[PDB]
Amino acid sequence: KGWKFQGEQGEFRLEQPEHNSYLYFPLVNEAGMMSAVTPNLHGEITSGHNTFLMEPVSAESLHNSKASRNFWVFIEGYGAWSVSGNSARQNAARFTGEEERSAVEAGFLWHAVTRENEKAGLKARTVSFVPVTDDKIELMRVTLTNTGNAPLKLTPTAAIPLYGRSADDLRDHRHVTSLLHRIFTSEYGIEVQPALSFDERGHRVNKVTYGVFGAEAGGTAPAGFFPVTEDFIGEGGALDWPEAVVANREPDAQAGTAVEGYEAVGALRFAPVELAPGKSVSYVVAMVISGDRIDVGRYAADYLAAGRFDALLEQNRAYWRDKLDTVRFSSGDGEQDLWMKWVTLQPILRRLYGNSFLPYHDYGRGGRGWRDLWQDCLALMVMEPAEVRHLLLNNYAGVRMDGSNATIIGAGPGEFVADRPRVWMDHGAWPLMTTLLYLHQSGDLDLLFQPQSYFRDVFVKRCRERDASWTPEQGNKLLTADGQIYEGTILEHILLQNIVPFFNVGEHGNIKLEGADWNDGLDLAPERGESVAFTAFYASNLMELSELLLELQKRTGKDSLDIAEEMALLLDTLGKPISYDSIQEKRSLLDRYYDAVTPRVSGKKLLLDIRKVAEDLKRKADWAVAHLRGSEWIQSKEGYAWFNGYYNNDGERVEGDHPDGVRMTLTGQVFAIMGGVATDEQTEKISQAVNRYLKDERIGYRLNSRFGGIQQNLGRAFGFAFGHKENGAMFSHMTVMYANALYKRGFVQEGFEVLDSIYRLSADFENSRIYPGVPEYINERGRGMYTYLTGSASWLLLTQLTEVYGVKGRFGDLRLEPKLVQAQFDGSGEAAVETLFAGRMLRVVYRNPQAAEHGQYRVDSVSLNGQSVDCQAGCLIGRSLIEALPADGVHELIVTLGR
Amino acid sequence: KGWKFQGEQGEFRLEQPEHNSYLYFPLVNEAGMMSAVTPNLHGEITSGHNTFLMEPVSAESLHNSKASRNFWVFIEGYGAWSVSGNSARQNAARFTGEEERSAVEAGFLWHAVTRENEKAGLKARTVSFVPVTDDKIELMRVTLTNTGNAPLKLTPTAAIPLYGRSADDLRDHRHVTSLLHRIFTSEYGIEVQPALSFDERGHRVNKVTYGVFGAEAGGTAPAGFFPVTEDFIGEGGALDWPEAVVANREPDAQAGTAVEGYEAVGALRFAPVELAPGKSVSYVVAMVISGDRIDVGRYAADYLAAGRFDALLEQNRAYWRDKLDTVRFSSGDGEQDLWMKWVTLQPILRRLYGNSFLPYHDYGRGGRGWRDLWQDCLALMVMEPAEVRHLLLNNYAGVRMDGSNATIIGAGPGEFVADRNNIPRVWMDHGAWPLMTTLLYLHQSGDLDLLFQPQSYFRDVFVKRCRERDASWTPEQGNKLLTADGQIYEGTILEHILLQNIVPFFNVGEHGNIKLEGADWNDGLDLAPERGESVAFTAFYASNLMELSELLLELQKRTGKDSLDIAEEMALLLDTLGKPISYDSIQEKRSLLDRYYDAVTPRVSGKKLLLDIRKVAEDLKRKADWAVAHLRGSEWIQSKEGYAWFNGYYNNDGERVEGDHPDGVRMTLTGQVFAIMGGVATDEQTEKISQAVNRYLKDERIGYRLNSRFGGIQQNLGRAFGFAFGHKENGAMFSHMTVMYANALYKRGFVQEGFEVLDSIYRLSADFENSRIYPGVPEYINERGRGMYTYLTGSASWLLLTQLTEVYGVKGRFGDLRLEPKLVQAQFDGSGEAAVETLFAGRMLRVVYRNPQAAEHGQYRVDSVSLNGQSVDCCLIGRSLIEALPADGVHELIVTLGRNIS
Numbered sequence A: 001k002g003w004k005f006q007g008e009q010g011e012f013r014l015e016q017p018e019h020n021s022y023l024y025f026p027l028v029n030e031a032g033m034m035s036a037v038t039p040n041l042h043g044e045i046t047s048g049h050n051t052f053l054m055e056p057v058s059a060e061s062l063h064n065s066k067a068s069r070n071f072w073v074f075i076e077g078y079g080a081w082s083v084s085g086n087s088a089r090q091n092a093a094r095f096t097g098e099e100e101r102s103a104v105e106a107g108f109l110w111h112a113v114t115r116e117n118e119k120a121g122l123k124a125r126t127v128s129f130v131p132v133t134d135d136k137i138e139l140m141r142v143t144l145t146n147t148g149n150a151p152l153k154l155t156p157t158a159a160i161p162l163y164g165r166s167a168d169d170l171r172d173h174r175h176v177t178s179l180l181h182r183i184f185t186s187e188y189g190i191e192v193q194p195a196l197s198f199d200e201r202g203h204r205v206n207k208v209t210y211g212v213f214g215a216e217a218g219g220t221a222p223a224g225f226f227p228v229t230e231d232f233i234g235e236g237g238a239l240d241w242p243e244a245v246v247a248n249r250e251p252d253a254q255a256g257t258a259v260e261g262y263e264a265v266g267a268l269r270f271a272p273v274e275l276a277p278g279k280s281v282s283y284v285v286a287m288v289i290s291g292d293r294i295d296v297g298r299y300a301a302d303y304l305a306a307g308r309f310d311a312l313l314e315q316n317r318a319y320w321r322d323k324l325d326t327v328r329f330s331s332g333d334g335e336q337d338l339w340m341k342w343v344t345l346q347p348i349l350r351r352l353y354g355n356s357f358l359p360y361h362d363y364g365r366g367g368r369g370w371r372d373l374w375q376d377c378l379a380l381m382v383m384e385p386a387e388v389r390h391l392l393l394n395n396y397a398g399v400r401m402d403g404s405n406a407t408i409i410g411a412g413p414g415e416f417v418a419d420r421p422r423v424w425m426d427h428g429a430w431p432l433m434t435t436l437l438y439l440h441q442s443g444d445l446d447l448l449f450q451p452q453s454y455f456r457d458v459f460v461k462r463c464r465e466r467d468a469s470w471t472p473e474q475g476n477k478l479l480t481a482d483g484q485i486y487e488g489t490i491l492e493h494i495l496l497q498n499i500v501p502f503f504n505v506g507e508h509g510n511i512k513l514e515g516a517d518w519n520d521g522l523d524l525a526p527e528r529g530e531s532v533a534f535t536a537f538y539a540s541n542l543m544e545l546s547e548l549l550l551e552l553q554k555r556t557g558k559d560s561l562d563i564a565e566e567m568a569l570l571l572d573t574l575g576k577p578i579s580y581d582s583i584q585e586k587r588s589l590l591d592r593y594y595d596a597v598t599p600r601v602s603g604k605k606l607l608l609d610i611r612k613v614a615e616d617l618k619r620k621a622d623w624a625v626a627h628l629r630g631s632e633w634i635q636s637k638e639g640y641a642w643f644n645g646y647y648n649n650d651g652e653r654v655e656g657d658h659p660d661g662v663r664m665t666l667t668g669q670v671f672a673i674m675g676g677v678a679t680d681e682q683t684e685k686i687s688q689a690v691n692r693y694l695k696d697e698r699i700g701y702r703l704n705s706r707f708g709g710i711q712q713n714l715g716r717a718f719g720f721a722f723g724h725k726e727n728g729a730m731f732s733h734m735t736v737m738y739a740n741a742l743y744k745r746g747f748v749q750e751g752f753e754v755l756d757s758i759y760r761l762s763a764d765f766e767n768s769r770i771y772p773g774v775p776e777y778i779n780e781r782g783r784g785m786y787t788y789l790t791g792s793a794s795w796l797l798l799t800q801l802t803e804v805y806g807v808k809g810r811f812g813d814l815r816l817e818p819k820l821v822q823a824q825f826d827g828s829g830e831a832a833v834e835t836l837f838a839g840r841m842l843r844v845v846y847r848n849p850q851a852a853e854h855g856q857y858r859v860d861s862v863s864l865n866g867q868s869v870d871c872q873a874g875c876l877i878g879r880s881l882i883e884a885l886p887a888d889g890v891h892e893l894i895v896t897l898g899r
Numbered sequence B: 001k002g003w004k005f006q007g008e009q010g011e012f013r014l015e016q017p018e019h020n021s022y023l024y025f026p027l028v029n030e031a032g033m034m035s036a037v038t039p040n041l042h043g044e045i046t047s048g049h050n051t052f053l054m055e056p057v058s059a060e061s062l063h064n065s066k067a068s069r070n071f072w073v074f075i076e077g078y079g080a081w082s083v084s085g086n087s088a089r090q091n092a093a094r095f096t097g098e099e100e101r102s103a104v105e106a107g108f109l110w111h112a113v114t115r116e117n118e119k120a121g122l123k124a125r126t127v128s129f130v131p132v133t134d135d136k137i138e139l140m141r142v143t144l145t146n147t148g149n150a151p152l153k154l155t156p157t158a159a160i161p162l163y164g165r166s167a168d169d170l171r172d173h174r175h176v177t178s179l180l181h182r183i184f185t186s187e188y189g190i191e192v193q194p195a196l197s198f199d200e201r202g203h204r205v206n207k208v209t210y211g212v213f214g215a216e217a218g219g220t221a222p223a224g225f226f227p228v229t230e231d232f233i234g235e236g237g238a239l240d241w242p243e244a245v246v247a248n249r250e251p252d253a254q255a256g257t258a259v260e261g262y263e264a265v266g267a268l269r270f271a272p273v274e275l276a277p278g279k280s281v282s283y284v285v286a287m288v289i290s291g292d293r294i295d296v297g298r299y300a301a302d303y304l305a306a307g308r309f310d311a312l313l314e315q316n317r318a319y320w321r322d323k324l325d326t327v328r329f330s331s332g333d334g335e336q337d338l339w340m341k342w343v344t345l346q347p348i349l350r351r352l353y354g355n356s357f358l359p360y361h362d363y364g365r366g367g368r369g370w371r372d373l374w375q376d377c378l379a380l381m382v383m384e385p386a387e388v389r390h391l392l393l394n395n396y397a398g399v400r401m402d403g404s405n406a407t408i409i410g411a412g413p414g415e416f417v418a419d420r421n422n423i424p425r426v427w428m429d430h431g432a433w434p435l436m437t438t439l440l441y442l443h444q445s446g447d448l449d450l451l452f453q454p455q456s457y458f459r460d461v462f463v464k465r466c467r468e469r470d471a472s473w474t475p476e477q478g479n480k481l482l483t484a485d486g487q488i489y490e491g492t493i494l495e496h497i498l499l500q501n502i503v504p505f506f507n508v509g510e511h512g513n514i515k516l517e518g519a520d521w522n523d524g525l526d527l528a529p530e531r532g533e534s535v536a537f538t539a540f541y542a543s544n545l546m547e548l549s550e551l552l553l554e555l556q557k558r559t560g561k562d563s564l565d566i567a568e569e570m571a572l573l574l575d576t577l578g579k580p581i582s583y584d585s586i587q588e589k590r591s592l593l594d595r596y597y598d599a600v601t602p603r604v605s606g607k608k609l610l611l612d613i614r615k616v617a618e619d620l621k622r623k624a625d626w627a628v629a630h631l632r633g634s635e636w637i638q639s640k641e642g643y644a645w646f647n648g649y650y651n652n653d654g655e656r657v658e659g660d661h662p663d664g665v666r667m668t669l670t671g672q673v674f675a676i677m678g679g680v681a682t683d684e685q686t687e688k689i690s691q692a693v694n695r696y697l698k699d700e701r702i703g704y705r706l707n708s709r710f711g712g713i714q715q716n717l718g719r720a721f722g723f724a725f726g727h728k729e730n731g732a733m734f735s736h737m738t739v740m741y742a743n744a745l746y747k748r749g750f751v752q753e754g755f756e757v758l759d760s761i762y763r764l765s766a767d768f769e770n771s772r773i774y775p776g777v778p779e780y781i782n783e784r785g786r787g788m789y790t791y792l793t794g795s796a797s798w799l800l801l802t803q804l805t806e807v808y809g810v811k812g813r814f815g816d817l818r819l820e821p822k823l824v825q826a827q828f829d830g831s832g833e834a835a836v837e838t839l840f841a842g843r844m845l846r847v848v849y850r851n852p853q854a855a856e857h858g859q860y861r862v863d864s865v866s867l868n869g870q871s872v873d874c875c876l877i878g879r880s881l882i883e884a885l886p887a888d889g890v891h892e893l894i895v896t897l898g899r900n901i902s
């Protein structure tokens, strides 16, 4: 029995939720409170790597640690009882068929745990959410209801175990750092403000304060406190069976008590209460992180006063509804439409958690990587576009003059940090892809001619050597001969990122793997490894760049490109061409370029004919396409055929026939298809090979087939068990990209199969054991792993919107090109998407009254708010017609399909 | 109800032991298995920072984590039951007055947990120990007994949760590293050998293997296994209530199964068994760490075959009995005598754990520090003296030519490691301890030639006591000081000692006392490197210089030695021999030290001067006399209330730390101890110090505090003051310093005062209601009276040494045996005797003091001494008389005490 959606806004319910290991749900705000909550109220609460309110956890902690959030009721005639079932007594009923009835319900963005004590006649409902205010705070409301025939006498105790320091102290100096604790009680609760912090930052004064406060529903303060963990649990006790609750002790402390040197717990004893039959009492608990001592009075008024929890919960619901209403799908698959709303949430979660601080994500420290800078723009372009232009510009400051980039992202806009060395060969590919998407959604072609600096640190020639001339006095920006900061166009940056890899070839003529590509686990072939997979991506990028430049001339009238003089060496088609068949000549020309720009550029720029640069780019792209088709197209003895993706550190071809089974990678196929290196015939054959070697009937499209044992000339990924992480799991991000590539090329039935498999696997709860959303991967047992924060959600959202429903920009104009299959249309012959375009909410409704399959339909007519529209692949609508619409409301655009 | 000793070899029992938080007991061998076991079988098992078999823990884990060692019985008519009480059902009885009867018993070196299920009529007894074999292994034997009227039907399951990787992975990449697990089942159990290790060493291939194996008493293998943790516990389960046990599921795996990518548990299902009334069945479980895949057949034969557990347990008992029989006390306080056997164990534990890998000691990675090199020699001198000479020689290789030393200790004998990237603290006290330890060796052994052995000096990028980085250093020079012609410089051990003590003499702050540098003994006084001063250790260096002077003159008187071979550059520091500087001038002392540093950096000339041993002695005595007068005249302070004592410190603002202050007088114990021990304090000053200590430091509940309360953090002095008052180095009863205080008192003849101090340590430690610890001396007694950081503390070495050499007064003087009892009347037993068995000059002596007149200390003298039934001349016995005794046996030495005349 999996979860079931309730209503039409994505709310779900799961019965007996704690009968599933490892479940958790995210609660977060922009202010920076980051929490996870499990069905028994375990998880974690933090504002950062150094400021955990609750103990840092990984997945095994969710069952193995007793320190959940808790709320206790000492019931007369029964004794101690946890509202979430986390007591030794209640846990002892697991697997005996005597378990209490329980449920989780959740929505955007809140979580509710219910439990029933049939013996005592008591029901509890505990609602958790992070308010969308400017405070780092999580709220909990516990409502107790008497379901029996006679009055119940109850003594309530909230208990939030506190940690209140860096994850660095989890074990290392865990005890020593407890001696630094200072606990302060006041009318509404408990503050912990360690005197000092001891962690990897060193030994420093601390002012950060962690608070647990509470009140009855009417605002009445707690009767008293047990702020010291060892006194709360008692001698030989534990947090799932604490003496203070179990023996119903009188409180240890009242308001104004200070205690030093002990682990703390936010244990708030409320007044005993007599609850009438059928009636309820409620309690609100607040968990707070602040930069200094907390103004507890203000927090009590804002969060604990009567009615504040309920008003703030409504405000949370309206804020999240508003964020997620920017993309809505409506089809014949009602369940998948609602599942997609959870997918739509995920890119926001990734931003707000910094890919960290959820139980599986046990290594992240909340930062951003280079890839995140570009990937975060995908969801924002369709959900919240105002910020994207400034983000893209800032990102290009990270590029070095050798096409590589900074890999540590700083605090400020366009701030990058030099490393106290690894190059990922794919890092140069993603920016053009993201930037092109922006250009097509916005029509803002002038972005390309904005000025920007280049990043500079000790590492030169793509981190192959240290610059001898470097000091602290150079700074973090590339300098000219005359000592000025060099600035080049965004387009110059883009050109550099794509043309440098073209020349950076290995002994088999494909682009070097360097420290890894997209697959972070292919890290053991920096000397001789090659990523054929991303050679296809760079080949495609160069071709798109050529087309872009010619379209810039055709649309803008622009005839020249301002480029650093030294870059002319790499555009050899304009001067003395080299042979692209010669590895030696390509490498030598690249070395000449590196020499010309290290340590400084001249600062002089050449103006080059935009058509002649385009011709140089097309020559590069054509050479690469021909080389991949002629040299890297492989076949097994059985007769399946596909593209080799890799060479290993011994210069050996990775893919093809092998002892113990054929070796194939999904990554080696995706960009060949997406970018056009693969012909239509090759693409059909690749899809057959993928289905034959990679498509598992239990777990879907694997990232790779099985390589037996560790592969120390290729990557650490192969030390993972087969079916997990980057070793042969269904890795959602790559599988979505595969589907995207198929749809792009017109392989719609094949693309549909891929996307539908991701949904079906994710939603098959008996195996996946996850809440609605797309996980990072589906593993060898069919379990969903590393939930919520995966970049796959961005790609899934984008693919559904821009490929499947086919609502996308073309140089700022709106293009409609549906790739919906017949089964996707609802009972009235309709499928619809609501989406933001050119600053307006559109509801694009596709009508298929003849019930034609994809390939048998075309666009017959388009109407916009009840007037007929002109339509210039598919149908194209000028941007001015969208912009002339009113700002408020959803404007209906009806596309009628016929045979 | 605390623990109670049983029998006369130190075994104890504690009833309802899990009614106490944070208790644990150590099990360890020389092979390198290091474990801790709690009353519910929690703790940890490891061979090192990177090779934990069970999950790394700290103190809070002992209650908060469900992952104890466990052994389960599914009892027909009752259900799942843990032999240690660690089940959700059993834990739910805590605080309800319905708890099962339980107990811990332990001895040297083994642990037993007992429990009774009165409802089912079942009793269990689980014995844990680490065999004394060459394997890294812990054994467990569970014995189940039917105490009821009818047959019991039982299904047993052992369950040792596995971790099997570095403590670095505890959370950071915890899940990712589980994907590297490879589990292999075989007839007798489960092996986990991760394919790779990801930790602070990097990403590497792994071969280390972690095993859990088992058998019935008669040798029968397990019926099957549940090797995968999530399958053992079940969906929504936990290790204290696992579905495989609770629902009595059939095993997941048999011998020959391999599973990859999952957290593992050594869950061994045994055959169901019908147990008759009054009868027992037993099971043996083995937990193994090995450098490669385990020869499971050999381990089964060696550890699981019938009778092996019991034979190995007897071998463990005999090995530990043998180690601890080297020192035995016998007095009127029988309980304290047995408590002292546990104290006697502690220095061994500190060596074998490397001060790490017990739950409170949650930061250690198993290494040794500079202090440990010298401190480990104290216990060895009394317990295993054969090793000490070579250890001392090796240790001196760590000294730099500026008197400082290496602070990272390597694998090999006399191996020290440079850290070139990270700027290293200097601890100002590090130069003081070696002479103290070495003098003890010289007096126990009589081996004065040690002083003239050659040894190198340590050399790395850091020069002038880590004040500067040397531009001229390279990797090809090596880690040893070089001469002008590129040869490795060697100087005598004595040269090393001189250097360590004379350099600090000149290294003075603005108030004329020796600089604090990065800290002294108190590691928490780390925030005054620029202007801080340790007056406390200035007294120690003053005393060292005086003892050195006396030592050199005694070398001449005893050996005939007239000269000392010393590096030419060191003559600058012995200024009394050339052009004397004024020791009253800070500027001149600092300038002379800078000249010395310049003369020896980057290299020495290699040339040596021969100096008159009397003239060097005169220079040393002049230094010591100057320091004694300066401390007495400038650092003796008084409160307005009228107490007086020595100021111990200046802070980083150049302010005197101790004395009157708003919110209360500031005083440190450390500032008193070495002044007393070394003679800077006169007898009159010592009496007054003792009064000030009792006034300002002696707490009625927790004993002699390390310092009085300074309100709030002290960012110009040390991070210690961020600790709550009464914990760690902020005002706790810190055993190591308090023992040293007692030692100092006894040394100076303040015997009643000394006795009070030592007795307070024992009484606090053994007052279980507050201390909540097993027998032994903890690192500290805290604000609530709790014993903290058990077993591994250096205080045990000092307590052992003080009891032997000061209290019973059995000690060497240049290799001859000196007997000087400082026992009080209350210490004599019912027959008027107090005795100590101890090794001296390679012979076991039982020194028996008879006080038939029941005289108090101060009212008695030595009336006669007999040795193996013959009269002895003198109180001081020549080493030849001890050496002429037979090698085997304990030789009785009877010292008869009588009253004074007048």
Ligand SMILES: O=P(O)(O)O[C@H]1O[C@H](CO)[C@@H](O)[C@H](O)[C@@H]1O
Binding pocket: A371, A518, A519, A520, A521, A726, A733, A776, A786, A789, A790, A791, A792
């Ligand atoms: O965002 P996801 O789904 O978790 O993907 C992660 O792993 C990818 C493959 O190594 C990487 O390419 C990504 O950068 C990321 O680390």
Ligand SMILES: O=P(O)(O)O[C@H]1O[C@H](CO)[C@@H](O)[C@H](O)[C@@H]1O
Binding pocket: B371, B521, B522, B523, B524, B729, B735, B736, B779, B789, B792, B793, B794, B795
């Ligand atoms: O051996 P013990 O009793 O645990 O003492 C420890 O703390 C002392 C004071 O900081 C140090 O001086 C010791 O070196 C040691 O780190």
Ligand SMILES: [Cl-]
Binding pocket: none
């Ligand atoms: Cl019950």
Ligand SMILES: [Cl-]
Binding pocket: A364, A365, A366, A367, A368
């Ligand atoms: Cl990070």
Ligand SMILES: [Cl-]
Binding pocket: none
């Ligand atoms: Cl019961």
Ligand SMILES: [Cl-]
Binding pocket: B364, B365, B366, B367, B368
């Ligand atoms: Cl260490």
